[PDB]
Amino acid sequence: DPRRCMRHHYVDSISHPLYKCSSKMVLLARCEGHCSQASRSEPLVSFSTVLKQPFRSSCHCCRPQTSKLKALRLRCSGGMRLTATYRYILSCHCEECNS
Amino acid sequence: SDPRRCMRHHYVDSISHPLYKCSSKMVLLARCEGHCSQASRSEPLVSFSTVLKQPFRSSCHCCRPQTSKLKALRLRCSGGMRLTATYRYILSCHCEECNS
Amino acid sequence: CAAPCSCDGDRRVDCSGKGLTAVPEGLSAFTQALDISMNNITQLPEDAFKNFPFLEELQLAGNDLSFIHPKALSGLKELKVLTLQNNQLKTVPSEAIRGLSALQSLRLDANHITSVPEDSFEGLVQLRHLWLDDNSLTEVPVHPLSNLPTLQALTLALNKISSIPDFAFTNLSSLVVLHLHNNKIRSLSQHCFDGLDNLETLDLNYNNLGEFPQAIKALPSLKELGFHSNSISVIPDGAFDGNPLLRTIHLYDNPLSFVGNSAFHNLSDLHSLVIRGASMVQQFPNLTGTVHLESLTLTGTKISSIPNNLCQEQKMLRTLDLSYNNIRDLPSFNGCHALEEISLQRNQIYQIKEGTFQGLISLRILDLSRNLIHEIHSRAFATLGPITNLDVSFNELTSFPTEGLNGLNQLKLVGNFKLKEALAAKDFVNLRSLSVPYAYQCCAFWGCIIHCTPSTGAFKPCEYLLGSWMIRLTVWFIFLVALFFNLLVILTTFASCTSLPSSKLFIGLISVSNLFMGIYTGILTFLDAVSWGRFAEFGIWWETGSGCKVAGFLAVFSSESAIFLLMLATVERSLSANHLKQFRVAALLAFLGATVAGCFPLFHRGEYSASPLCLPFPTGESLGFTVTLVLLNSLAFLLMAVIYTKLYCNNSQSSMIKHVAWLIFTNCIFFCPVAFFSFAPLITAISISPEIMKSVTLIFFPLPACLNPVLYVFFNPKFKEDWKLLKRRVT
């Protein structure tokens, strides 16, 4: 089944915008897909005069599990390079949005 | 008309006060369940600094209520008592982002 | 949109809350939900919903609807929810809902329906929820109900059904919920619940069942059962046999008398069990299999023993109530790790052993009141650390250990009479509420936020008995004067061998009575001097021993004898203004009566136990002997005044008369102040403080005992000189 929660790859040129720089392409990772579990929202009942949270909602989302902090010095055409950063998703799975 | 779409369903539940001696009542409730065509994703935020804060651009859609109304149920208990139970009745539902 | 509606929503038109008397026109034809509840529509004409072919939900509650045309609901093939409650339908419309094969939920409650036609519910092949409560149905529509195999919920509450016949629900294989409460059901046939294999909830409350139903052995999926507020008295041995998935059972408000021993066993899903009023139960119920209980309650029975394997078999218990039984031996509670509340009041427990309460980490509340416990060891209290409430009251305690109870927040030890020792105040630092067997026990805790129950005041001092440094000085002066002056007068009077006149005679006896009053004041002063600033450990022994009884006798005997002796003196002068023999016999009778009046309060109960001074009328919040005594004293003083008035109007004789006068006067005023303080609740006496009252009672009650002799020794001289003369002449 191709519609399951998987990890895809893309590119993207890198150049420091706040200050002139050169460009560099690195491989990123992202998640995309549909999970088997459905989403539901049921109302709550309470005997108190003051109201409360009206509904109880559950929902699963395809979200990253494991990441690595990396860095990439570039060329800003300056007195020094200023560096960047991100997380390199290595595995992705479904999880509750409100967990 | 896919059976797995984000739609609304009805069910019956029985309401009784936990402490006071009150007669049980059977009520009808609306529940929304299904699936959305749009998928979820999370992309790494490219930050340019020495500190990283939640570098994942998440976008996940969920089937949640859209319009609802508040109705109260008068529960009759032993002797003289008028305990009131309140709940929101779901009128319509759609797919909206969990974060936004 | 149209003038009287909202029409705003996702094809959802709501017009509820208006005075529309008919279905509005001009709405969109794609409306999927119409809400026209709470209006003045009383009749639906033929083809009244031909402009809404795609409608799915229709609400008509709150109207005065009383007639539905057979062809009114035509073309609504997508209708799923139909509500018709709070209307005036006299019968179920059978020919109007025939063409509703897509219907799923139908409400017909709060109507005046009393008959169900046999052709009803023929055509509804997808019905799931049905409401038939708040009506006047006298029987179950068996034949109409055998047409809905897909029904899931059914309610028949608030009706007048008397009995359920055989095979009433023999065709509903999908029903999950059934309500039959608030009816007049009093008999159930054996084969009445056959075919309900998927049923999970059964409600039979507020009925008139006389015997336990044996027809419940046919629902293997039953989980919740309720039959409270019935007339069931006997639960047969082995009742819940075909219901292994039960989780909630309600059986309160029933006159239960006997419960079978092997009746609640082998129920692994039950979580609570509360039984009250089972008078004819004398054995602990068998619970081999029911090991998931979180609250056990067995009170009002005749159970005398507890099985030793109660905690070992089950580890889920949080509360335990076993009051009002005949339990006398407590088994070891080691094993109930999750237990928090224990109630064992109103039993016959006589001892507490070392291992009784060992191994209770979570114990918080303990109740052992009215158990007649008299022996408690120095153990079974250290293992229970987080304990706040400890109720041990109305027992026969003699010594209360104070180890391991430093974490208490509320203690109750009121009712015990053999506990006269003082509790250490350093072991109850965290304590906040206290009640003690004796009033003086609050002195150690409260000073030398606790708010102890006795609430000691002026009459129960903690530091100074007498009070300030003035009354103490006033009572010390009265004791030093009256004793020596009275002794000197007796010695001077009973010296000569010559014949003694009666007028001269009564003086000696007034003196001997007073001498007794000076002895009482001296006893009080010695007691005050012995215990100075430490009226805490000398209070219980004094007020609950033999010293108080002796002191109280002297005060009453001395005070009452003088008044009676003074009455004879006035009559003696009146008669004089032969009879000498009768006066001695009269004096002897007066002394005998004074002795009886003094000893009467020594035998009854609650008296001589109101103040540390042991006086009879320290207010006595005993209203007998006190009130009785104060009224008798007032009547005797009025008679002497009248007699002397009589004599008022009526050399040496003049001197004697004048002497008997001063005493009828010197005495009158003081009886006056004490008696006024006494009548306090009738006039409220402008809310006299209890300290000024105690000070006035101490100063004035023995005050005449010292002024009476000085009016005869040096002040107002009549014959004292002769006495000295004759005595000195004697010496």
Tab-separated table of N, CA and C in Angstrom, chain B residues 8 10-12 14 21-28 66-67 69 76 78 89 91-93, chain C residues 10 12 57 81 105 107 128-131 153-155 158 177 179 181-182 203 206 252-253:
chain	number	residue	atom	x	y	z
B	8	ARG	N	-20.829	12.321	10.133
B	8	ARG	CA	-21.374	12.352	11.482
B	8	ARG	C	-22.249	11.129	11.724
B	10	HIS	N	-24.752	8.905	14.853
B	10	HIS	CA	-25.580	9.020	16.044
B	10	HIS	C	-25.458	7.770	16.905
B	11	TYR	N	-25.574	7.916	18.250
B	11	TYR	CA	-25.555	6.815	19.202
B	11	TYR	C	-26.295	7.242	20.462
B	12	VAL	N	-26.687	6.234	21.275
B	12	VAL	CA	-27.446	6.457	22.500
B	12	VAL	C	-26.560	6.148	23.698
B	14	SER	N	-26.559	6.386	28.252
B	14	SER	CA	-27.339	6.473	29.479
B	14	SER	C	-26.612	7.363	30.477
B	21	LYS	N	-28.903	10.080	44.371
B	21	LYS	CA	-29.849	9.086	43.867
B	21	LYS	C	-30.746	9.744	42.828
B	22	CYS	N	-30.404	9.506	41.546
B	22	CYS	CA	-31.137	10.111	40.444
B	22	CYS	C	-31.482	9.045	39.416
B	23	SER	N	-32.675	9.120	38.850
B	23	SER	CA	-33.100	8.177	37.826
B	23	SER	C	-32.301	8.383	36.546
B	24	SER	N	-31.887	7.221	35.877
B	24	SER	CA	-31.073	7.290	34.673
B	24	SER	C	-31.898	7.773	33.484
B	25	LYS	N	-31.286	8.406	32.565
B	25	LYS	CA	-31.894	8.911	31.345
B	25	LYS	C	-31.125	8.397	30.137
B	26	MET	N	-31.837	8.115	29.011
B	26	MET	CA	-31.254	7.675	27.750
B	26	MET	C	-31.339	8.827	26.759
B	27	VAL	N	-30.165	9.236	26.207
B	27	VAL	CA	-30.083	10.405	25.343
B	27	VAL	C	-29.377	10.029	24.049
B	28	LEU	N	-29.606	10.863	22.984
B	28	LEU	CA	-29.035	10.650	21.661
B	28	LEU	C	-27.893	11.633	21.441
B	66	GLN	N	-17.582	21.500	13.481
B	66	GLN	CA	-17.600	22.854	12.944
B	66	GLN	C	-18.616	23.747	13.639
B	67	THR	N	-19.867	23.307	13.685
B	67	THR	CA	-20.922	24.053	14.354
B	67	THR	C	-21.601	23.161	15.382
B	69	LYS	N	-24.219	23.307	19.235
B	69	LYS	CA	-25.089	24.058	20.127
B	69	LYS	C	-25.079	23.410	21.503
B	76	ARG	N	-33.638	14.327	37.182
B	76	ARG	CA	-34.490	14.267	38.363
B	76	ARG	C	-33.943	13.216	39.323
B	78	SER	N	-33.576	11.636	43.537
B	78	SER	CA	-34.431	11.260	44.655
B	78	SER	C	-34.815	12.486	45.475
B	89	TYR	N	-24.230	19.574	21.352
B	89	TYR	CA	-24.716	18.719	20.281
B	89	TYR	C	-24.080	19.150	18.966
B	91	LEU	N	-23.666	19.785	15.212
B	91	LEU	CA	-24.532	20.072	14.074
B	91	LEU	C	-23.873	19.776	12.734
B	92	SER	N	-22.572	20.036	12.605
B	92	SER	CA	-21.855	19.787	11.363
B	92	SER	C	-20.390	19.533	11.681
B	93	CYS	N	-19.695	18.914	10.710
B	93	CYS	CA	-18.292	18.573	10.881
B	93	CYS	C	-17.545	18.766	9.570
C	10	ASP	N	-24.919	24.664	6.809
C	10	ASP	CA	-24.599	23.845	5.613
C	10	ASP	C	-25.870	23.118	5.183
C	12	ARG	N	-28.894	23.572	6.454
C	12	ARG	CA	-29.473	23.199	7.771
C	12	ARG	C	-30.335	24.367	8.200
C	57	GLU	N	-33.165	14.866	8.705
C	57	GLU	CA	-33.486	14.986	10.120
C	57	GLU	C	-34.632	15.970	10.293
C	81	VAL	N	-33.721	10.475	11.417
C	81	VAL	CA	-34.025	10.835	12.797
C	81	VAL	C	-35.355	11.577	12.820
C	105	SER	N	-33.814	6.386	14.217
C	105	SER	CA	-34.119	6.848	15.565
C	105	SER	C	-35.518	7.443	15.590
C	107	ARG	N	-38.451	8.977	18.494
C	107	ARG	CA	-38.806	9.376	19.851
C	107	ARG	C	-40.314	9.562	19.931
C	128	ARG	N	-33.168	1.525	14.977
C	128	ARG	CA	-32.124	1.240	15.953
C	128	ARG	C	-32.450	1.737	17.351
C	129	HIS	N	-33.066	2.908	17.482
C	129	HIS	CA	-33.363	3.515	18.772
C	129	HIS	C	-34.850	3.822	18.847
C	130	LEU	N	-35.466	3.454	19.982
C	130	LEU	CA	-36.895	3.660	20.172
C	130	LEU	C	-37.152	4.191	21.574
C	131	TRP	N	-37.943	5.248	21.693
C	131	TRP	CA	-38.339	5.847	22.962
C	131	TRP	C	-39.838	5.653	23.153
C	153	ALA	N	-31.620	-0.137	21.126
C	153	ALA	CA	-31.959	0.521	22.378
C	153	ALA	C	-33.471	0.578	22.522
C	154	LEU	N	-33.936	0.363	23.754
C	154	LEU	CA	-35.363	0.386	24.036
C	154	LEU	C	-35.580	0.868	25.461
C	155	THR	N	-36.566	1.741	25.650
C	155	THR	CA	-36.927	2.255	26.962
C	155	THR	C	-38.436	2.182	27.144
C	158	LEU	N	-41.338	4.857	33.320
C	158	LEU	CA	-42.393	5.808	33.672
C	158	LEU	C	-43.728	5.434	33.029
C	177	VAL	N	-29.471	-2.231	25.273
C	177	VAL	CA	-29.943	-1.404	26.378
C	177	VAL	C	-31.441	-1.616	26.541
C	179	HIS	N	-34.539	-0.411	29.468
C	179	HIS	CA	-34.936	0.319	30.666
C	179	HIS	C	-36.381	-0.015	31.005
C	181	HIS	N	-37.568	0.884	34.490
C	181	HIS	CA	-37.680	1.412	35.839
C	181	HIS	C	-38.904	2.317	35.973
C	182	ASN	N	-39.237	2.659	37.232
C	182	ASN	CA	-40.367	3.529	37.568
C	182	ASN	C	-41.686	2.975	37.032
C	203	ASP	N	-32.322	-2.441	33.742
C	203	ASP	CA	-32.744	-1.498	34.771
C	203	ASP	C	-34.126	-1.898	35.266
C	206	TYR	N	-37.263	1.084	41.184
C	206	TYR	CA	-38.533	1.723	41.535
C	206	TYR	C	-39.734	0.890	41.087
C	252	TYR	N	-29.674	-1.415	46.957
C	252	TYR	CA	-29.982	-0.700	48.185
C	252	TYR	C	-31.464	-0.328	48.224
C	253	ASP	N	-31.908	0.226	49.361
C	253	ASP	CA	-33.306	0.593	49.600
C	253	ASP	C	-34.230	-0.616	49.481
